[PDB]
Design a protein around this ligand. Sequence first.
Ligand SMILES: Cc1cc2nc3c(=O)[nH]c(=O)nc-3n(C[C@H](O)[C@H](O)[C@H](O)COP(=O)(O)OP(=O)(O)OC[C@H]3O[C@@H](n4cnc5c(N)ncnc54)[C@H](O)[C@@H]3O)c2cc1C
Ligand SMILES: Cc1cc2nc3c(=O)[nH]c(=O)nc-3n(C[C@H](O)[C@H](O)[C@H](O)COP(=O)(O)OP(=O)(O)OC[C@H]3O[C@@H](n4cnc5c(N)ncnc54)[C@H](O)[C@@H]3O)c2cc1C
Ligand SMILES: Oc1ccc(/C=C/c2cc(O)cc(O)c2)cc1
Ligand SMILES: Oc1ccc(/C=C/c2cc(O)cc(O)c2)cc1
Ligand SMILES: [Zn+2]
Ligand SMILES: [Zn+2]
Lengths: 230, 230
Amino acid sequence: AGKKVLIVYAHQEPKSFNGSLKNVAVDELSRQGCTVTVSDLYAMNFEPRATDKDITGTLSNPEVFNYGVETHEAYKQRSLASDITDEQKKVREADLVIFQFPLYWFSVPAILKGWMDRVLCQGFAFDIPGFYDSGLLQGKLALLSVTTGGTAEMYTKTGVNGDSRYFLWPLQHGTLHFCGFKVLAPQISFAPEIASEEERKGMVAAWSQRLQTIWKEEPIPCTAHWHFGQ
Amino acid sequence: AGKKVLIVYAHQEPKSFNGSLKNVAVDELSRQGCTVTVSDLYAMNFEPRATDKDITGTLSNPEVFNYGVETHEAYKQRSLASDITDEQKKVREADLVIFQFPLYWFSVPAILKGWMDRVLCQGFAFDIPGFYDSGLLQGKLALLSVTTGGTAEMYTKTGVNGDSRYFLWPLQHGTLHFCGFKVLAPQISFAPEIASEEERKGMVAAWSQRLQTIWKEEPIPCTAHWHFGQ
Ligand SMILES: Cc1cc2nc3c(=O)[nH]c(=O)nc-3n(C[C@H](O)[C@H](O)[C@H](O)COP(=O)(O)OP(=O)(O)OC[C@H]3O[C@@H](n4cnc5c(N)ncnc54)[C@H](O)[C@@H]3O)c2cc1C
Ligand SMILES: Cc1cc2nc3c(=O)[nH]c(=O)nc-3n(C[C@H](O)[C@H](O)[C@H](O)COP(=O)(O)OP(=O)(O)OC[C@H]3O[C@@H](n4cnc5c(N)ncnc54)[C@H](O)[C@@H]3O)c2cc1C
Ligand SMILES: Oc1ccc(/C=C/c2cc(O)cc(O)c2)cc1
Ligand SMILES: Oc1ccc(/C=C/c2cc(O)cc(O)c2)cc1
Ligand SMILES: [Zn+2]
Ligand SMILES: [Zn+2]
């Protein structure tokens, strides 16, 4: 019983802290005997814009363009742009999808946001009905591995940035859970630029160490209480 | 004397509900005598990716590419790509920046995320000393005008999507407030696709009417309490 992993990676520099975290994941999961695939978005020059170029067939309404409607129809007819279907194939086969990225404005870098916007279309990732616990990617695991500029202290309730879980809401709930993913606890590597050489190596080792037993983990309760308490 | 407004618009279809909200804003603000500029991101084929092409000339460290450091240095040395500087000029001169967009995965469409990632660089929108209340864009007003697929009921504390204020956090606090923007109350037009014509017309009317007294509005207390508290 093997497992397949897709790492959607979003950093411009191979020598970056993000690059090291991505490589550590490939090394550890590969060592485990897992099947591993990496979508290096910047290297792929991945298209982030949601446009009519994403559909190649006859549009449902050539007069008024509705991205959601056209992509849902294109998915069912198999007339979506190939770059989108290539990503869907990787996701469809994956047991676990890891997103590796530096936090950009309390969210994912635009190139990765584009991957989410374009790859997770209706018909593929969810249906209406067929979302949240009934999402089409149910049975699959998702995990956000994020790096930040701000420190852990800043990312606390009384901190200037608020608790780190607050900014995970759109990603974990609005996106991943909506599509049916079981969400594993996020891996947040706080302020590596401020950290020391030892601290940086420590965060990298902690990630690799966690991956050793990632398949034994339970997903988080992706609810408002988990994210905001109250 | 007078007021300058920049509308950053992110929708592919001019006939869309978003297009109508953008047009009503232009009409009303223009009628008031305001100076109005619109950045139609899709029509501009606006680049969302944060890459080394955002720096003209030669990089400060061609060994290891650090987007944040490179763009900060480029800003101070007047070596940023023209598409970025064109947007910065519009923002610098604006008294109010309205973002008009459909909610994509509890956030902004990737093309607009790209505008935020690339236009709001260090040195321009903020600096080590000036962030949040001390943000470099202080004195300026920002307003998020968003449309959703989900209904208002769904966007409640106990609703499947959670309170709408939950998804505003990354945008209003992590981005706008961080840059010094005084954040005006968001304009949320819930599920125009489900609503009836009478309701749609009502939503557009409320927007136009709100615009009549926008200069009399006081900014919201962009705090964790406002977004998550009671
Ligand atoms: C547009 C934009 C928006 C942003 N928004 C936010 C935000 O909202 N909130 C926030 O907190 N931050 C934000 N940031 C900060 C951003 O998260 C950091 O700048 C980013 O993490 C820097 O690159 P990264 O790879 O960590 O680290 P670098 O790549 O910065 O790595 C840090 C250090 O780690 C060293 N290193 C690399 N690999 C190893 C290794 N294996 N062992 C030991 N050391 C190693 C590097 O050489 C380097 O000195 C934003 C940045 C940008 C550009
Ligand atoms: C990638 C993606 C991710 C998404 N993620 C989310 C999410 O996380 N959460 C969520 O809630 N939704 C989400 N959505 C739904 C999305 O927000 C809506 O589909 C979007 O708002 C639809 O277009 P819009 O312009 O409202 O409306 P249309 O453009 O859909 O407009 C609706 C109706 O308004 C009519 N209309 C236009 N102008 C006027 C006018 N002046 N007067 C009266 N009627 C008018 C139109 O003709 C149309 O019938 C997502 C969609 C996509 C494609
Ligand atoms: O080039 C850059 C562009 C933007 C940023 C933003 C950093 C930042 C750090 C925080 O702790 C909180 C926050 O909301 C934002 C850093 C570098
Ligand atoms: O092409 C598309 C891709 C994604 C979506 C998502 C819709 C959606 C609607 C909600 O009420 C909540 C949510 O978290 C997501 C719609 C169309
Ligand atoms: Zn959830
Ligand atoms: Zn705030």
